JSON list of N, CA and C in Angstrom, two decimals:
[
{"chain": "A", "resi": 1, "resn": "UNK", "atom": "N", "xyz": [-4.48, 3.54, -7.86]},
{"chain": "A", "resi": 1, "resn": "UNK", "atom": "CA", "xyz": [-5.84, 2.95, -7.75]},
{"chain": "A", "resi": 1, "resn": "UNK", "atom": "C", "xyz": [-6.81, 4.02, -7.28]},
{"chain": "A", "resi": 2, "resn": "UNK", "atom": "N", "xyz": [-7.82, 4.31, -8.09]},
{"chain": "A", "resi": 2, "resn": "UNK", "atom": "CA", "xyz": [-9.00, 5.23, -7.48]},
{"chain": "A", "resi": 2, "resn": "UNK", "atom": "C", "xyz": [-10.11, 4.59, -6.72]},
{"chain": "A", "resi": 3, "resn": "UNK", "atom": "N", "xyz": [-10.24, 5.40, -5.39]},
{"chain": "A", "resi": 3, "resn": "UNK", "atom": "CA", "xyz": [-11.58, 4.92, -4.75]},
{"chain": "A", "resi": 3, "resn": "UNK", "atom": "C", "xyz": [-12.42, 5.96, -4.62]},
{"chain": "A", "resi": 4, "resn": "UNK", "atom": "N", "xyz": [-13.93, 5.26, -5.13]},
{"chain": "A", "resi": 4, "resn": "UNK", "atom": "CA", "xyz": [-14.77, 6.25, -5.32]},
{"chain": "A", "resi": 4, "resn": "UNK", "atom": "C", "xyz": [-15.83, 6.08, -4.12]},
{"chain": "A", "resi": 5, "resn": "UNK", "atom": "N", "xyz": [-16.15, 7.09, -3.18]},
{"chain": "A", "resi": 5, "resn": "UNK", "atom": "CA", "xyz": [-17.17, 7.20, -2.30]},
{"chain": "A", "resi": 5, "resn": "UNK", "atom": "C", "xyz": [-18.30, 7.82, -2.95]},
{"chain": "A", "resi": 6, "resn": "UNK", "atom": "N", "xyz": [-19.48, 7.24, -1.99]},
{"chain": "A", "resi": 6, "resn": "UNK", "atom": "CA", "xyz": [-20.87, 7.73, -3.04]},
{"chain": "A", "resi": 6, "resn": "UNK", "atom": "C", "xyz": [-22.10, 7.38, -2.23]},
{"chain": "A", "resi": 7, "resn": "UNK", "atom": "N", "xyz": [-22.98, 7.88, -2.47]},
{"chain": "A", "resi": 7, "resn": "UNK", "atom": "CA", "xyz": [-24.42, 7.47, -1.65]},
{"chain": "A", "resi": 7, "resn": "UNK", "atom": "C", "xyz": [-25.61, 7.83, -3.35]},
{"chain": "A", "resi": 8, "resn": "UNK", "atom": "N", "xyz": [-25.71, 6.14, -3.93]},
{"chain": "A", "resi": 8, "resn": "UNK", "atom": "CA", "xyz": [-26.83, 5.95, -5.33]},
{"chain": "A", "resi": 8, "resn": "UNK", "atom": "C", "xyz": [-27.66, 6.15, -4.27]},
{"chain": "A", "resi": 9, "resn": "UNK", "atom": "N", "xyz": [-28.89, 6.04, -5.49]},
{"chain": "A", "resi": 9, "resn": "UNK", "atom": "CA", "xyz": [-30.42, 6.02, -5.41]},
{"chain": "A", "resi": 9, "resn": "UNK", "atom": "C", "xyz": [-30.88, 4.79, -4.39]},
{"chain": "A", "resi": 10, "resn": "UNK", "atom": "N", "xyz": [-30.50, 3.96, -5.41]},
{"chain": "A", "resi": 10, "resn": "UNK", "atom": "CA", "xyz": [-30.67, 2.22, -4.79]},
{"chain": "A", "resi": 10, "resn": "UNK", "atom": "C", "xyz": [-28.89, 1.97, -4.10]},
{"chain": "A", "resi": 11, "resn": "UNK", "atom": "N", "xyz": [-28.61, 1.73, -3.12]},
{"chain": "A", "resi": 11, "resn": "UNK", "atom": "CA", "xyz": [-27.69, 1.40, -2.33]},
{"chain": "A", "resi": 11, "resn": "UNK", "atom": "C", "xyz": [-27.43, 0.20, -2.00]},
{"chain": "A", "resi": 12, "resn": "UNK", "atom": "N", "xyz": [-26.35, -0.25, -2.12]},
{"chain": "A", "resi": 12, "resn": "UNK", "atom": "CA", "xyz": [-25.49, -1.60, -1.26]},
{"chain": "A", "resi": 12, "resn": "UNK", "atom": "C", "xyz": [-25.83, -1.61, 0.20]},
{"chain": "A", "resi": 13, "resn": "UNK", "atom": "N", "xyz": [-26.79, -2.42, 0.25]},
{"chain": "A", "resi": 13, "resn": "UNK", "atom": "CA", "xyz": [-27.55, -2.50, 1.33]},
{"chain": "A", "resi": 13, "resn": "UNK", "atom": "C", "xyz": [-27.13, -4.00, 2.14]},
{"chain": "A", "resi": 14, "resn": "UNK", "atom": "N", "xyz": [-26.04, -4.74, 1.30]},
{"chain": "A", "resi": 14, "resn": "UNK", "atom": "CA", "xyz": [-25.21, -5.84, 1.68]},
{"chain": "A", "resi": 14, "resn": "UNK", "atom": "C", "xyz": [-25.66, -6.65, 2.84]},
{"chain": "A", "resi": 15, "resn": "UNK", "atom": "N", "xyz": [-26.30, -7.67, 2.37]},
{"chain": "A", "resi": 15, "resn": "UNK", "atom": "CA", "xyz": [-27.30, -8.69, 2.91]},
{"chain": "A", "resi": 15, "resn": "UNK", "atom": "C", "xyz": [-28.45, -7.80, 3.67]},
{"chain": "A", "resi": 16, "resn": "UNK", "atom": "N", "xyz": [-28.73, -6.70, 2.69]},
{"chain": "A", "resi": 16, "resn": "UNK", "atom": "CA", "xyz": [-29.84, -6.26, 3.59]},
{"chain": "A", "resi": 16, "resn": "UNK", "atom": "C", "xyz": [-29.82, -5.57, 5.10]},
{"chain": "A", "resi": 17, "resn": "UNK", "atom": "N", "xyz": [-28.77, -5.13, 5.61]},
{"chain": "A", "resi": 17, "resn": "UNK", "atom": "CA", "xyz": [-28.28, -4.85, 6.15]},
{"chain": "A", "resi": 17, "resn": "UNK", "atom": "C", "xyz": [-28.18, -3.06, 6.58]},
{"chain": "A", "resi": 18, "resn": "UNK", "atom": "N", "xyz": [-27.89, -2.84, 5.88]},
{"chain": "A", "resi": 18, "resn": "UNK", "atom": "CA", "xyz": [-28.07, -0.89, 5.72]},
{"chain": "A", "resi": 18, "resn": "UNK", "atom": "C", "xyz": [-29.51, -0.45, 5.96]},
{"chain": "A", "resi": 19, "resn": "UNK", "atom": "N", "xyz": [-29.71, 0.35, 6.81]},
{"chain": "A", "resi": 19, "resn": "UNK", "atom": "CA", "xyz": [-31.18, 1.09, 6.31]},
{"chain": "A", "resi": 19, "resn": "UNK", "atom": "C", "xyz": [-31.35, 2.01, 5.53]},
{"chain": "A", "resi": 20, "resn": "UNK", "atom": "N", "xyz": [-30.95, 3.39, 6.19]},
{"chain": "A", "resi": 20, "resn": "UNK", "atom": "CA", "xyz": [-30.82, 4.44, 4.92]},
{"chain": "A", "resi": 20, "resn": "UNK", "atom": "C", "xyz": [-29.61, 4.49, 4.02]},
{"chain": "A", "resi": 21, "resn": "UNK", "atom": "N", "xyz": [-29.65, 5.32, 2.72]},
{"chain": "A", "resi": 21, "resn": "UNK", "atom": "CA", "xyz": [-28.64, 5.75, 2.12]},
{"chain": "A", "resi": 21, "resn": "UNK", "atom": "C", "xyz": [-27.02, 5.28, 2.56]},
{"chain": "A", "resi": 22, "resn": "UNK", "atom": "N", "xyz": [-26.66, 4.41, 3.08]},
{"chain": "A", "resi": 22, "resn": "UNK", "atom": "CA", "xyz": [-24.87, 4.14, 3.16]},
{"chain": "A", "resi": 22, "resn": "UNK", "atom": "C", "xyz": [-24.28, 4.39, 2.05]},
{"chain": "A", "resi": 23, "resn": "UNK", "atom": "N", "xyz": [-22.91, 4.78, 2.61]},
{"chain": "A", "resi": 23, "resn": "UNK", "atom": "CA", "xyz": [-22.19, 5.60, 1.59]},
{"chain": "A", "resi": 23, "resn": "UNK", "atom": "C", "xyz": [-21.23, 4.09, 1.60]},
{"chain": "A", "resi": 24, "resn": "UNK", "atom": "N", "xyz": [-21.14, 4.20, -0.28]},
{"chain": "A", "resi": 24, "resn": "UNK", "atom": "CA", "xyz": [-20.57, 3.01, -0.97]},
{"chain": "A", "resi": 24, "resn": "UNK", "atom": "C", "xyz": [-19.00, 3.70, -1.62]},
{"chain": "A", "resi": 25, "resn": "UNK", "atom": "N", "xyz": [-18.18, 2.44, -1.02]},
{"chain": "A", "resi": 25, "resn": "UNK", "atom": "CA", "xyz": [-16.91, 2.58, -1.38]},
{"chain": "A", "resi": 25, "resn": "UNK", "atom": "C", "xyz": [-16.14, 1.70, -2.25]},
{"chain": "A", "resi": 26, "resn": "UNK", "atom": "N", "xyz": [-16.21, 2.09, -3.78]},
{"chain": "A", "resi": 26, "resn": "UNK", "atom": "CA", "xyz": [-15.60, 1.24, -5.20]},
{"chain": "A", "resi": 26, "resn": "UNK", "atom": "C", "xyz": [-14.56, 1.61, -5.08]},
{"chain": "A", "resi": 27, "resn": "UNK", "atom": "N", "xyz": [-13.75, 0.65, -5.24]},
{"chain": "A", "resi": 27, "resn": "UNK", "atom": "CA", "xyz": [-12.00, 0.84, -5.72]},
{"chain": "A", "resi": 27, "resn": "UNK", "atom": "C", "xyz": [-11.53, 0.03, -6.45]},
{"chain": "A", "resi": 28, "resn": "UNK", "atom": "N", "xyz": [-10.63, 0.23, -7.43]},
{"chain": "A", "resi": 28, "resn": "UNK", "atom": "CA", "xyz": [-9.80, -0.80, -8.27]},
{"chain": "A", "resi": 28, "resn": "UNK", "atom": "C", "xyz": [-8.64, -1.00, -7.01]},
{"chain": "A", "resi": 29, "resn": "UNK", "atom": "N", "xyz": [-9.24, -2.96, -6.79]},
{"chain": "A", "resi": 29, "resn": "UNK", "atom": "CA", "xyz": [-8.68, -3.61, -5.69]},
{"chain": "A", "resi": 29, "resn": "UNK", "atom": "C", "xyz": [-7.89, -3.85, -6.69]},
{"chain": "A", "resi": 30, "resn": "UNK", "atom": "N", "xyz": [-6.61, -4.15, -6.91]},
{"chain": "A", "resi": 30, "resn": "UNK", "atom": "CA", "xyz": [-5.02, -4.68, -7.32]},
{"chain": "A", "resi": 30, "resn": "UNK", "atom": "C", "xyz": [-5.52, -5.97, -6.78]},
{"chain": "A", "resi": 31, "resn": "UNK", "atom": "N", "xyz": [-5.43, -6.90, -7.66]},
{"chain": "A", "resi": 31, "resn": "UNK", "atom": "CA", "xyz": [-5.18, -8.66, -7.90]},
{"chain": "A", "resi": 31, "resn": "UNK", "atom": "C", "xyz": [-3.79, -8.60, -8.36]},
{"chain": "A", "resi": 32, "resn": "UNK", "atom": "N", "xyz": [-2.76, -8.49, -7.91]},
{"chain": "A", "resi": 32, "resn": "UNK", "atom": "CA", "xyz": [-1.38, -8.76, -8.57]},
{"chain": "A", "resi": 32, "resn": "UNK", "atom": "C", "xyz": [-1.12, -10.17, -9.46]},
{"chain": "A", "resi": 33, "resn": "UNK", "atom": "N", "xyz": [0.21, -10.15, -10.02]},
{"chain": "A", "resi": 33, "resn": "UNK", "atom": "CA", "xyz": [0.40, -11.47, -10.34]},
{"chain": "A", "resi": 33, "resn": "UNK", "atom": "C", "xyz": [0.38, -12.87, -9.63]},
{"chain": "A", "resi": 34, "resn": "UNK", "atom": "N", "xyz": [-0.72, -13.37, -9.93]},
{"chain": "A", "resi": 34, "resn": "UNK", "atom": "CA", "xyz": [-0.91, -14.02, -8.71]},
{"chain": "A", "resi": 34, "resn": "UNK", "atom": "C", "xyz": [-1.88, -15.22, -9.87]},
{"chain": "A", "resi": 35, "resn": "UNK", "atom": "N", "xyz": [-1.14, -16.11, -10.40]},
{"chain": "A", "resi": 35, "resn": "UNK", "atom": "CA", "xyz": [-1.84, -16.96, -11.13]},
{"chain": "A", "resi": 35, "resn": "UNK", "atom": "C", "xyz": [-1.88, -18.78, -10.41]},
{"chain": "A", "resi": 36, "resn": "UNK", "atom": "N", "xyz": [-3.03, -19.12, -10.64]},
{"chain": "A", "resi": 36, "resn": "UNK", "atom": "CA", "xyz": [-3.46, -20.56, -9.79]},
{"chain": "A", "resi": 36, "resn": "UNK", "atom": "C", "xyz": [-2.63, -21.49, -10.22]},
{"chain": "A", "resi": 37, "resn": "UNK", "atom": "N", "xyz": [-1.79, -22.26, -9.44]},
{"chain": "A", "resi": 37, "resn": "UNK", "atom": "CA", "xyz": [-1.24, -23.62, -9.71]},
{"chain": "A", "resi": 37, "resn": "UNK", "atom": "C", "xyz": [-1.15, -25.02, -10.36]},
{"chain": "A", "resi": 38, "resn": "UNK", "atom": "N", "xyz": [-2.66, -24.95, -10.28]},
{"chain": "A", "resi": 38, "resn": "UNK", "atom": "CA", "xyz": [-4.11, -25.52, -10.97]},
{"chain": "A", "resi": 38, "resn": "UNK", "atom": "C", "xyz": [-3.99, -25.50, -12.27]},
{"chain": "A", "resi": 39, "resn": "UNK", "atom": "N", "xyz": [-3.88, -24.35, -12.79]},
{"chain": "A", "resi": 39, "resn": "UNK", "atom": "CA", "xyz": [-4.13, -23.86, -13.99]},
{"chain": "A", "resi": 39, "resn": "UNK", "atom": "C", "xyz": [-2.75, -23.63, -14.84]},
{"chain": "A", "resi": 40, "resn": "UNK", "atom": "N", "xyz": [-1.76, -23.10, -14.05]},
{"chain": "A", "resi": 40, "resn": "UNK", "atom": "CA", "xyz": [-0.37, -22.61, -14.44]},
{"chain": "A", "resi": 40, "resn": "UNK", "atom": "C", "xyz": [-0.04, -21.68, -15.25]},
{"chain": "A", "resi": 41, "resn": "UNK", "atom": "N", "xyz": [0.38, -21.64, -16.19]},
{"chain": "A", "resi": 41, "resn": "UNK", "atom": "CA", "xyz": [-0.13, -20.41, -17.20]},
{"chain": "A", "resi": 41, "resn": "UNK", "atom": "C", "xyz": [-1.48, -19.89, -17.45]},
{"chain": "A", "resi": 42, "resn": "UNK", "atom": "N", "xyz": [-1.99, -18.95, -17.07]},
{"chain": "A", "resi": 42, "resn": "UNK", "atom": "CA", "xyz": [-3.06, -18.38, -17.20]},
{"chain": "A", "resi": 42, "resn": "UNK", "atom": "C", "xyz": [-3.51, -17.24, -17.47]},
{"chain": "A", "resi": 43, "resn": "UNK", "atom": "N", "xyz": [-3.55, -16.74, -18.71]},
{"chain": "A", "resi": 43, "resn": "UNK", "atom": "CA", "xyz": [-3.68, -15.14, -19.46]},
{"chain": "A", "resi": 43, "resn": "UNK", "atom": "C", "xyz": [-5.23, -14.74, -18.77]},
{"chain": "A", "resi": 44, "resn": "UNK", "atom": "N", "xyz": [-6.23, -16.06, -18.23]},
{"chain": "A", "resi": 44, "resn": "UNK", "atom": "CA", "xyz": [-7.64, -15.34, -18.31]},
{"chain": "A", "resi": 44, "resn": "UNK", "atom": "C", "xyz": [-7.70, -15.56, -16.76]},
{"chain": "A", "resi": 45, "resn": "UNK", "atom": "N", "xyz": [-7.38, -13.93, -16.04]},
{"chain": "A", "resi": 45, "resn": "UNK", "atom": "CA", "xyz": [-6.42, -13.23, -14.88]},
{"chain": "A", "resi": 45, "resn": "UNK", "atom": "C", "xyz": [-7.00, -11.58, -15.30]},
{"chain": "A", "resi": 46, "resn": "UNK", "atom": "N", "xyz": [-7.82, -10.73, -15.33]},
{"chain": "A", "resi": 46, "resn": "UNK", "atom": "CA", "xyz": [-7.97, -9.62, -15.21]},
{"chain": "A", "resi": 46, "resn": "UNK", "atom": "C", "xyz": [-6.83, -8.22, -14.86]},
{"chain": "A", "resi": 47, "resn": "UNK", "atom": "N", "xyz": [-6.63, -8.06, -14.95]},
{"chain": "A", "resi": 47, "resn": "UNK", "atom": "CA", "xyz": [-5.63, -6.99, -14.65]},
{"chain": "A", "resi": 47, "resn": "UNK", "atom": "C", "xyz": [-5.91, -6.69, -12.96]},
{"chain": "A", "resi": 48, "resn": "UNK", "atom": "N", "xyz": [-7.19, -5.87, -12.78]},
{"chain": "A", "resi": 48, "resn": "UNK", "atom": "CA", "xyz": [-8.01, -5.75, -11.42]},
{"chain": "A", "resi": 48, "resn": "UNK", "atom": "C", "xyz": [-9.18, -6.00, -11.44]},
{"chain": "A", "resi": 49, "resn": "UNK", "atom": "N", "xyz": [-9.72, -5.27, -9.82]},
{"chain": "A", "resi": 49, "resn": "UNK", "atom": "CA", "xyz": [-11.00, -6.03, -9.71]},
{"chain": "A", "resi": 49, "resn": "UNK", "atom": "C", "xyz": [-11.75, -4.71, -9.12]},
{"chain": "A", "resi": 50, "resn": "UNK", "atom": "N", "xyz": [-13.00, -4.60, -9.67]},
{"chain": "A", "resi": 50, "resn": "UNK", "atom": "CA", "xyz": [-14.04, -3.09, -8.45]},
{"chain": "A", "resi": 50, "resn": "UNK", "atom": "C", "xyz": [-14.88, -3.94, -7.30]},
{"chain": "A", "resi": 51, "resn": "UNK", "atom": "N", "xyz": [-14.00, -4.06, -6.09]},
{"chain": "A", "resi": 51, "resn": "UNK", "atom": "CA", "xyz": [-14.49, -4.26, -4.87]},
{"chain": "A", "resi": 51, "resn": "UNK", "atom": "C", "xyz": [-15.16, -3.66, -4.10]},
{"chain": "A", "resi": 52, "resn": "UNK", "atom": "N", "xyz": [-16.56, -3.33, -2.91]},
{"chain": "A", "resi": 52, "resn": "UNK", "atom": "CA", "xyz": [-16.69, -2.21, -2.62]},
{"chain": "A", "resi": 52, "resn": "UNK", "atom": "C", "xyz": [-17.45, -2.62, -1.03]},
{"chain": "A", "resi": 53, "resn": "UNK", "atom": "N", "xyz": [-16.82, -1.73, -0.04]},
{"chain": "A", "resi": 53, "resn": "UNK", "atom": "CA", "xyz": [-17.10, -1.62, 1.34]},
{"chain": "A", "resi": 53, "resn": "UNK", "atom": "C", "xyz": [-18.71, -0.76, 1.16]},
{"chain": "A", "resi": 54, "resn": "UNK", "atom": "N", "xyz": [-18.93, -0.64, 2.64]},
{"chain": "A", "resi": 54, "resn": "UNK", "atom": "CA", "xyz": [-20.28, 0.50, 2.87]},
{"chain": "A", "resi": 54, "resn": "UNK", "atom": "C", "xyz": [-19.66, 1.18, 4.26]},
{"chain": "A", "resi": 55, "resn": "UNK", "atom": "N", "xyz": [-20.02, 2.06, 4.96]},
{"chain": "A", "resi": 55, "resn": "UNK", "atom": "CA", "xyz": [-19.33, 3.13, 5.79]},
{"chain": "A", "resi": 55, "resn": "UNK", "atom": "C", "xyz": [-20.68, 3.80, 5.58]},
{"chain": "A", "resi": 56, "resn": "UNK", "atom": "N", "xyz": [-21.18, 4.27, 7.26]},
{"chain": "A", "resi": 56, "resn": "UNK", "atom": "CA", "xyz": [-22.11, 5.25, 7.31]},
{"chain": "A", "resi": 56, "resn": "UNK", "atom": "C", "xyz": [-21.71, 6.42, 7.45]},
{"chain": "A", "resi": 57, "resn": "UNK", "atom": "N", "xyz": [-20.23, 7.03, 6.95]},
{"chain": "A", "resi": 57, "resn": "UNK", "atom": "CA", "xyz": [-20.26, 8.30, 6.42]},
{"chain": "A", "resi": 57, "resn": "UNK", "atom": "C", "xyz": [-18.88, 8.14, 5.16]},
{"chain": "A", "resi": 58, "resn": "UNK", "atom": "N", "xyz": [-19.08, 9.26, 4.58]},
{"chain": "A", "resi": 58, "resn": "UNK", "atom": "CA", "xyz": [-17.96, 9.75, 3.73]},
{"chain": "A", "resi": 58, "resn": "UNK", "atom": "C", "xyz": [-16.41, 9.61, 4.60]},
{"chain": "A", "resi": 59, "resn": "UNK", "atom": "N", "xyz": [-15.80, 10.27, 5.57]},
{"chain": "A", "resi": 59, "resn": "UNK", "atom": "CA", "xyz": [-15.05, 10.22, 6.24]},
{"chain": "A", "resi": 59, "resn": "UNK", "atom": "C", "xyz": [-14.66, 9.10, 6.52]},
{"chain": "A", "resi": 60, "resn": "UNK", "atom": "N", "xyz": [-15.63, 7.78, 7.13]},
{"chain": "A", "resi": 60, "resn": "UNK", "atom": "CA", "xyz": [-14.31, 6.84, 7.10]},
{"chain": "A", "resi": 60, "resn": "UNK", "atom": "C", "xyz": [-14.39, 5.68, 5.91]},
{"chain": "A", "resi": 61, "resn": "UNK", "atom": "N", "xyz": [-14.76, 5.99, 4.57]},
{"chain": "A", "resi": 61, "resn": "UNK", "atom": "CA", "xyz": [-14.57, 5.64, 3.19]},
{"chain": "A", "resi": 61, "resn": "UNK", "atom": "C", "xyz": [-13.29, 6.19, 2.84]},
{"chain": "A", "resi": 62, "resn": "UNK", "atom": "N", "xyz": [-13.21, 7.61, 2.64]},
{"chain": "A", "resi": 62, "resn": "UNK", "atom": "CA", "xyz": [-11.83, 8.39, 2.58]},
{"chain": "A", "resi": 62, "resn": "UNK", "atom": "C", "xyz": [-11.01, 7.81, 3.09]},
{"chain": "A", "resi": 63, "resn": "UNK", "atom": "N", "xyz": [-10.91, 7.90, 4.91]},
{"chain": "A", "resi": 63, "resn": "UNK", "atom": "CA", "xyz": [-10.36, 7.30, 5.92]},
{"chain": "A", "resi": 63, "resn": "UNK", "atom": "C", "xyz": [-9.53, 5.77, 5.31]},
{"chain": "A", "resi": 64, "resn": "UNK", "atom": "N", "xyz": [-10.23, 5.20, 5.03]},
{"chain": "A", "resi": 64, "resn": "UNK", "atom": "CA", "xyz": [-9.69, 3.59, 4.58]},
{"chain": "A", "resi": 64, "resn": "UNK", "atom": "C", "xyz": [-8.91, 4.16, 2.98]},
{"chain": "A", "resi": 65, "resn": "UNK", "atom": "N", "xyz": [-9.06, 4.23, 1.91]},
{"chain": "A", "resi": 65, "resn": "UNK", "atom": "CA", "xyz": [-8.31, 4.49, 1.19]},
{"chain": "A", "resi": 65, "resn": "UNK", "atom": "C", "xyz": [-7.07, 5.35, 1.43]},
{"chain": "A", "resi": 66, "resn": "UNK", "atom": "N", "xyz": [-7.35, 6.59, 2.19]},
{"chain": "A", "resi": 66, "resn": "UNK", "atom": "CA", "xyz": [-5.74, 7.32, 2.57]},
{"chain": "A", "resi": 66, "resn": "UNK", "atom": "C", "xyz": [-4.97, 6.37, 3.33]},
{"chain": "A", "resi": 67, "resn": "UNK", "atom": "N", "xyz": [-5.74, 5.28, 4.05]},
{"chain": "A", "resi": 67, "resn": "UNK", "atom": "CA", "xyz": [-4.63, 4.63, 4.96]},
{"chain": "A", "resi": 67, "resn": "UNK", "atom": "C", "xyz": [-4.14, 3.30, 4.46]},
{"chain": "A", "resi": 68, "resn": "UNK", "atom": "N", "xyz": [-4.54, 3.16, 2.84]},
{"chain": "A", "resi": 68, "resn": "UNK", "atom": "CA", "xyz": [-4.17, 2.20, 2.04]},
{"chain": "A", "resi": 68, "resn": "UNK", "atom": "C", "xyz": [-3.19, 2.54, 0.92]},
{"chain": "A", "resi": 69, "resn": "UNK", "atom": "N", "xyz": [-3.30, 4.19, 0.81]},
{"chain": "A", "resi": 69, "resn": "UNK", "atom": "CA", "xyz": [-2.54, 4.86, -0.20]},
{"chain": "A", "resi": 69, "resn": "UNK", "atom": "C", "xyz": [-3.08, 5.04, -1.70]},
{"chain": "A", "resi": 70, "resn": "UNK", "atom": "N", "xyz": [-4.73, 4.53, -1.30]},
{"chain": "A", "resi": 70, "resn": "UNK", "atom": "CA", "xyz": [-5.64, 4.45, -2.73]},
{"chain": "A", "resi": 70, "resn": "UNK", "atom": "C", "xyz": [-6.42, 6.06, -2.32]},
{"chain": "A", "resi": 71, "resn": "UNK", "atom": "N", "xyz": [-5.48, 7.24, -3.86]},
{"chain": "A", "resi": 71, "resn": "UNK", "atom": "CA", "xyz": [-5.65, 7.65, -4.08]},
{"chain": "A", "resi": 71, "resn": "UNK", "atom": "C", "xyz": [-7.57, 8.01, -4.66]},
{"chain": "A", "resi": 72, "resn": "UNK", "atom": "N", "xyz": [-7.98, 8.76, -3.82]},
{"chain": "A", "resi": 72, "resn": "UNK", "atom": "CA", "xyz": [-9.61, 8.74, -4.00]},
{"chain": "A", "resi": 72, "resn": "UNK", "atom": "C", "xyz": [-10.38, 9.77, -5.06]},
{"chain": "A", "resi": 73, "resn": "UNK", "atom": "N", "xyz": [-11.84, 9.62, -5.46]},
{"chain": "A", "resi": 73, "resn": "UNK", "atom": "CA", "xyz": [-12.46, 10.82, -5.62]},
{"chain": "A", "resi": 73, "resn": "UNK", "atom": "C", "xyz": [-13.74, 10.71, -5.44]},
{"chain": "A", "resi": 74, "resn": "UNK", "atom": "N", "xyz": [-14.51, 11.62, -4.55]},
{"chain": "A", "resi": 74, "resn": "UNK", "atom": "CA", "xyz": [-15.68, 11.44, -3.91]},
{"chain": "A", "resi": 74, "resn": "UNK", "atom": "C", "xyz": [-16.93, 11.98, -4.99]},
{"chain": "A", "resi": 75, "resn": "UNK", "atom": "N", "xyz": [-17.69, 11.22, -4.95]},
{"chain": "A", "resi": 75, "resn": "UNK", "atom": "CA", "xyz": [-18.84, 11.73, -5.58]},
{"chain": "A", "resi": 75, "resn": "UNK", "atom": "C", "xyz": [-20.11, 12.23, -4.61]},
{"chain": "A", "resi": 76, "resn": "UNK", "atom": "N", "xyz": [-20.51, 13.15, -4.64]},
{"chain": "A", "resi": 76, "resn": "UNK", "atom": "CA", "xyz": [-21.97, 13.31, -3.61]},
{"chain": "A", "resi": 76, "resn": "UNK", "atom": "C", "xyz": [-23.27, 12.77, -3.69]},
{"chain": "A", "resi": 77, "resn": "UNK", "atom": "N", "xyz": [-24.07, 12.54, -3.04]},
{"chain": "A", "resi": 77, "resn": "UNK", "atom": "CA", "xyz": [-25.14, 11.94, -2.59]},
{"chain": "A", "resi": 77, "resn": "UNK", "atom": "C", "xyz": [-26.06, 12.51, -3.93]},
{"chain": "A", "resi": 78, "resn": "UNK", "atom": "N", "xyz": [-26.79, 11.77, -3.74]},
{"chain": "A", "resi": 78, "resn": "UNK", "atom": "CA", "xyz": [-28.02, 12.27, -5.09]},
{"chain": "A", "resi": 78, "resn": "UNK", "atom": "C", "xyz": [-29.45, 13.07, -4.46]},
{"chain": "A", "resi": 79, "resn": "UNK", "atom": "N", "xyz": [-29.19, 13.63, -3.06]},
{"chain": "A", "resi": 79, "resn": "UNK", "atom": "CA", "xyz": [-29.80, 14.70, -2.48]},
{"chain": "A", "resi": 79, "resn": "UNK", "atom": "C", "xyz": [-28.65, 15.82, -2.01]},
{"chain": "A", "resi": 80, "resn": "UNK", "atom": "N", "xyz": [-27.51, 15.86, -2.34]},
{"chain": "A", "resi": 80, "resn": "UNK", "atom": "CA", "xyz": [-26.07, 16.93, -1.53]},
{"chain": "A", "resi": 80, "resn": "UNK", "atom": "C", "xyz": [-26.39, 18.51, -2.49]}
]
């Protein structure tokens, strides 16, 4: 699973919440086999999902994926 750290233009500012630039953390979250009861057989189940935290630095974005074993790759800020 890759997680990508990053600081866009326009930022995940998540309920408004962030002031400057927070650095945004996408990863292909793993949904395993894991189909509803409800439903029972169910092909329309995605493989995965792009979930994404905020972290006011790079370091503990990294930080959380190495300690999940989600292999990362960082992108830089759109002023770096």
């Amino acid at each position: 699973m890759s997680a990508k750290i990053y600081r866009p233009a326009k930022t995940a500012m998540q309920s408004g919440t962030a002031k400057t630039n927070v650095w945004v953390l996408e990863f292909d979250a793993e949904v395993p086999r894991k189909i509803d009861p409800i439903m029972g057989y169910t092909s329309s189940s995605d493989m995965k999902q792009q979930v994404k935290l905020t972290f006011e630095t790079q370091e503990q974005a990294e930080a959380y994926a190495q300690r999940k074993g989600i292999e990362y790759r960082v992108i830089l800020p759109k002023e770096a």
